[PDB]
């Protein structure tokens, strides 16, 4: 797992601060709705 | 100057190809390039560089022919094409150049030499081809009709072959003759793309080294592009200067008492030098005045007088002509068994001479003498100098000749009548830092990109002088992995670092072919400042890389093209990069007495795509690798059984593509009917039943997604059930769901009306049957309006149909690029047999052949691997759609978005060309309202719950409702249970009960 002969790493195109972000999402509409958020309004 | 607006093609080989694209290699004239206006009313000599384009415009015939050659003159050959008449000529003598060949003036030729080929024989423009090679002069032409002013016309056309020619004459010269347009080009190697229509020629052709969109194209072997990110090339920085750092001392090695000496010694007491702590001049050696020969094992003569040696040693003897083939590794006989041995990686060199005129004497010389028997064989590099004798027989001697004990040493009759097989010889071997040879210095950078040439060791890199505390012993640093990374100087002594070049892949964005042609480059993992000539003022860095040609705003959207590190790319139609946006904002007035029920609902339906199976293929050994052939069929019997695993694997493959399609679509043991009269309650269903009018027997949303979507030893086999059994079996599926219900995937199948059965299935989702039959025609109005959106969607962009698209392209794709292996030589002379064999005799045409089969037995080996990982990901997907099926179409769902988003109805299956179809059907509510909420109510001290529903109040007045559709009703003790007395709970009211 080094550098030089031709080997790259590529980022992923998500970072963490967003993942944090939609789990805080999932997070704050089970707290405040329940299980309607997820079947309609 | 002018230049060539896409002008100069022509057909490359003798190959008629029908709307195909193709690649070729060969010389052309690049697009958009500087061409020279010549004006003759003036002709120059102009040099000749693998190829000329040729053309000229006149209204008369101002121009007359060519006068090529490589030193014009009357000295050497030459080549002459003239049109004086109706006739043409072709010359290979000429000979009789002059400083002005301006020509019924035919003032050229003055002289004549040994002749050649007579070929004398039968505005616009008329552009030429020149090129001469393998031999051979080869001519192309056309021409057409133009008007113009200035320079040229746009458009094109290919040129034809008209003539060859096996002149074999060098040509560095060309010349002209007049009697207006007179244009000059080069040519040079590059990769093309040409297109050919169905008649055969030439319309179209594009670049692969003018711009980013044309490389793009390339790699994608098409002319149309859509919107994405590519792989295209690689890039990497070249060095610039050079370093050849030596030792510093001087002084000529001593030869002459090795090569020049004037006795020599006994091959049985053959001596040994050791020369150190010089420089040495191995080419004059090489040259001198050649002995014998300059056989040298391991490296070459040729280039020998860059290297340096750490230790050379060298050894004389003098033995015969006849043993100086044993003077080898690897060699057996009397001087390589008892005088000199030689290791199996001897790496030296071997030179001798003839010296019958030194070593030879009238009568015999006896001061020479050789061994002829020891106990064991000499170690290499070993020598013997014990005179004892030697006991060959069993009767034993000590120190006396005789019987059975002869001397070990025997003289040579070197006598000067002798043949040259006899004659004597001197041969001496070298046997290869201190000897190193004449180089030269050049001053050390730093922090440059330069490429090394050390003492022996070679490469590019970055030199700097780093912080390596070593050991004061040693020179060279190394990290993990046996990386080279420190050098100590042969004139100084300093520690640097090496550090390789910076290198990385480089992508191309583009919007796509009919939107616009401006593309944008990501160099991946560089920093912007190792970029130059590319050069412009939108100059980006970012995590992924250096982005040029993309402007930055700080505002985010919802991004459809990626980069990487949540930066995205789009049109405006102007290309903008910025940050993704994952949504909306949104909260929930959330509060201790605050509540929400829906007063009306919505009817949804979506669709759903599955794959199922594969196509089955098989592929035959014997016809792929040798193929009508005799001689190669012998050849593989020595592999073993290497093909019959094969076709074992691959029909195992094969006969697994049938059971999935019983396991999804074979679930019932009869075959259903639907009623003739079609009254259902207000329905309509005429959009998923098949009909009766067209031949196929299948339903129009069938037929609109069966319209969108469609040698050497291999071959395709037939599946096992058609379509229209599938069709059937789909059919009595719709009609036992209709007709049925649920009942009949649990037994025998009874009869329900279908509101019924729709009523019941509101009750699996918390709605009473009552809500059904008030609201039956909105219901109906809302499941037929759905259905008819259907059509219209998959109508749409053809991009829902991804998935089974998918599956048939890759599976084409892989049988392509094993068809196309079959024209490799894989390290051989000819890709074709018949001429490996009708060229070469068999004792050596059958190494190349084994070099043939290891290639094409290993490609094929790639092919069966790769099926087989394949074939495990389409089995996850019928696994996939069984469950599907008992679940979702035999009955109704619990599980939270297993088949649609929302509240599950029913569901409907549809037949597809290698798949299948789901139809979810789905209760949505909507039309919210506020409310204020109680947990439970006293009453004459009591507490009081609901049974099932929540308490709501208007303001003034309080109710009892179900949980998912608005319906008020009075508070009675037949919708209520008591349970305790009402001091304990929080949040209780006070109201009355009836
Ligand atoms: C069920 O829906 C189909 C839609 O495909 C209806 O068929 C169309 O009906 C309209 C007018 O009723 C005609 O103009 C079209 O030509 C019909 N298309 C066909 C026959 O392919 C059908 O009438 C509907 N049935 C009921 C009972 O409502
Ligand atoms: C809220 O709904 C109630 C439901 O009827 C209404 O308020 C009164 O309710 C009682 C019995 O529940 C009825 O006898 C009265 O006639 C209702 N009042 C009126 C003006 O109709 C009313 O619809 C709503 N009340 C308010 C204050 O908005
Ligand atoms: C419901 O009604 C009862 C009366 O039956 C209320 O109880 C009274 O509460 C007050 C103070 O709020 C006391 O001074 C009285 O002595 C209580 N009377 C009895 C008989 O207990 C009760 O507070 C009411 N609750 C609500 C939420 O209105
Ligand atoms: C050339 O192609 C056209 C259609 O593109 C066709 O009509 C014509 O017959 C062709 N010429 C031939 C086959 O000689
Ligand atoms: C050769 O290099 C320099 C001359 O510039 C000298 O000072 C140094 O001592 C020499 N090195 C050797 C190994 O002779
Ligand atoms: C609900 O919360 C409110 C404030 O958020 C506060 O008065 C109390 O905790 C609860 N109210 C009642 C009436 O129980
Ligand atoms: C409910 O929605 C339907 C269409 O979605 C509409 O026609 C109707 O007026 C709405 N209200 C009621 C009470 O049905
Ligand atoms: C009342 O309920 C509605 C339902 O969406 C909500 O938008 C609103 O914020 C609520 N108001 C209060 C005061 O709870």
């Not at chain 2, 004086?84 to 010359?91: E, G, L, Q, R």
């Not at chain 2, 080929?117 to 056309?142: A, H, M, T």
């Not at chain 2, 593989?636 to 019983?662: H, M, P, W």
Request: charged share 15%.
């Amino acid at each position: 797992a080094q550098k030089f002969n031709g080997l790259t790493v590529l980022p992923p195109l998500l970072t963490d601060e967003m993942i944090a972000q939609y789990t805080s999402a999932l997070l704050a509409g089970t707290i405040t709705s329940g299980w309607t958020f997820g079947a309609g309004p | 100057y002018t230049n060539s607006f896409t002008r100069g093609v022509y057909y490359p080989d003798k190959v008629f190809r029908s709307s195909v694209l193709h690649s070729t290699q060969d010389l052309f004239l690049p697009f958009f390039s500087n061409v020279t206006w010549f004006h003759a009313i003036d002709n120059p000599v102009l040099p000749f560089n693998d190829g000329v384009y040729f053309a000229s415009t006149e209204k008369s015939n101002i121009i007359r022919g060519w006068i090529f050659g490589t030193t014009l003159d009357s000295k050497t050959q030459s080549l002459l094409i003239v049109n004086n008449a109706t006739n043409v000529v072709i010359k290979v003598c000429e000979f009789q150049f002059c400083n002005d060949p301006f020509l019924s003036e035919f003032r050229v030729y003055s002289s004549a030499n040994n002749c050649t080929f007579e070929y004398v024989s039968q505005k616009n423009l008329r552009e030429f081809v020149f090129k001469n090679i393998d031999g051979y002069f080869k001519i192309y032409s056309k021409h057409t009709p133009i008007n113009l002013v200035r320079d040229l016309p746009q458009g094109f056309s290919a040129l034809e072959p008209l003539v060859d020619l096996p002149i074999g004459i060098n040509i560095t010269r060309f010349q002209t003759l007049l009697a207006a347009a007179y244009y000059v080009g080069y040519l040079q190697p590059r990769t093309f793309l040409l297109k050919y229509n169905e008649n055969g020629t030439i319309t179209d052709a594009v670049d692969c080294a003018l711009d980013p969109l044309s490389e793009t194209k390339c790699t994608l072997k098409s002319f149309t592009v859509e919107k994405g990110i590519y792989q295209t090339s690689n890039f990497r920085v070249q060095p610039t200067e050079s370093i050849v750092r030596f030792p510093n001392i001087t002084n000529l090695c001593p030869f002459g008492e090795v090569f020049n000496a004037t006795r020599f010694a006994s091959v049985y007491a053959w001596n040994r030098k050791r020369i150190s702590n010089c420089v040495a001049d191995y080419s004059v050696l090489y040259n001198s005045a050649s002995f014998s020969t300059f056989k040298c094992y391991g490296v070459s003569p040729t280039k020998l007088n860059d290297l340096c040696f750490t230790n050379v040693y060298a050894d004389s003897f003098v033995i015969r002509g006849d043993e100086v083939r044993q003077i080898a590794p690897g060699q057996t006989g009397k001087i390589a068994d008892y005088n000199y041995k030689l290791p199996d990686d001897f790496t030296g060199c071997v030179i001798a001479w003839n010296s019958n005129n030194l070593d030879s004497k009238v009568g015999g010389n006896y001061n020479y003498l050789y061994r002829l028997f020891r106990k064991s064989n000499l170690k290499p590099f070993e020598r013997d100098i014990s005179t004892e004798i030697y006991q060959a027989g069993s009767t034993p001697c000590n120190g006396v000749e005789g019987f059975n004990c002869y001397f070990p040493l025997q003289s040579y009759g070197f006598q000067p009548t002798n043949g040259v097989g006899y004659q004597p010889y001197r041969v001496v071997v070298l046997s290869f830092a201190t000897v190193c040879g004449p180089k030269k210095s050049t001053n050390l950078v730093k922090n440059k990109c330069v490429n090394f040439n050390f003492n022996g060791l070679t490469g590019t890199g970055v030199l700097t002088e780093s912080n390596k505390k070593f050991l004061p012993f040693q020179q060279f640093g190394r990290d993990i992995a046996d990386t080279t990374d420190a050098v100590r100087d042969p004139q100084t002594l300093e520690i640097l670092d090496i550090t390789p070049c910076s290198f990385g892949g480089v992508s191309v964005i583009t919007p796509g072919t009919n939107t616009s042609n401006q593309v944008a480059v990501l160099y991946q993992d560089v920093n912007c400042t190792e970029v130059p000539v590319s050069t412009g003022s939108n100059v980006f860095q970012t995590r992924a890389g250096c982005l040029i040609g993309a402007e930055h705003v700080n505002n985010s959207y919802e991004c459809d093209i990626p980069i990487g590190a949540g930066i995205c790319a789009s049109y405006q139609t102007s290309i903008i990069a910025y940050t993704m946006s994952l949504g909306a904002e949104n909260s929930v007035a959330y509060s201790n007495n605050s509540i929400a029920i829906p007063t009306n609902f919505t009817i949804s339906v979506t669709t759903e795509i599955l794959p199922v199976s594969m196509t089955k293929t098989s592929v035959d050994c014997t016809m792929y690798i040798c193929g009508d052939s005799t001689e190669c069929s012998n050849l593989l019997l020595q592999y073993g059984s290497f093909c019959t695993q094969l076709n074992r694997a691959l029909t195992g493959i094969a006969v697994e593509q049938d059971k999935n399609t019983q396991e999804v679509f074979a679930q019932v043991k009869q075959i259903y009917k639907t009623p003739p009269i079609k009254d259902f309650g207000g329905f309509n269903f005429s959009q998923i039943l098949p009909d009766p009018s067209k031949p196929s027997k299948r339903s129009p949303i069938e037929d609109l997604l069966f319209n969108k979507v469609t040698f050497n030893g291999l071959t395709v086999l037939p599946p096992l059930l058609t379509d229209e059994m599938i069709a059937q079996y789909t059919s009595a599926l719709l009609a036992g769901t209709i007709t049925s219900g649920w009942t009949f995937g649990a037994g025998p199948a009874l009869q329900i009306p279908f509101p019924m059965q729709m009523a019941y299935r509101f009750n699996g989702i918390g709605v009473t049957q009552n809500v059904l039959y008030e609201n039956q025609k909105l219901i109906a109005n809302q499941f037929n309006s759905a259905i008819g959106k259907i059509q219209d969607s998959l109508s749409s962009t053809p991009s829902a149909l991804g998935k089974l698209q998918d599956v048939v392209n890759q599976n084409a794709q892989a049988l392509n690029t094993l068809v196309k292996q079959l024209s490799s030589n894989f390290g051989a002379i000819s890709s074709v047999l018949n001429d490996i064999l009708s060229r070469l005799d068999p004792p050596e045409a059958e190494v190349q052949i084994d070099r043939l089969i290891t290639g094409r037995l290993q490609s094929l080996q790639t092919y069966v691997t790769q099926q087989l990982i394949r074939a495990a990901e389409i089995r996850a997907s019928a696994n996939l759609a069984a469950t599907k099926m008992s679940e979702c179409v035999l009955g109704q769902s619990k599980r939270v978005d297993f088949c649609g988003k929302g509240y599950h109805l029913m569901s409907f299956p549809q037949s597809a060309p290698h798949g299948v179809v789901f139809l979810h059907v789905t209760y949505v509510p909507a039309q919210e309202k506020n409310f204020t909420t109680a947990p439970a109510i006293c009453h004459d001290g009591k507490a009081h719950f609901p049974r099932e529903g929540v308490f709501v109040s208007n303001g003034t007045h309080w109710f009892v409702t179900q949980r998912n559709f608005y319906e008020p009703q009075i508070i009675t003790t037949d919708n209520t249970f008591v349970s305790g007395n009402c001091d304990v709970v929080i949040g209780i009211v006070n109201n009355t009960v009836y």
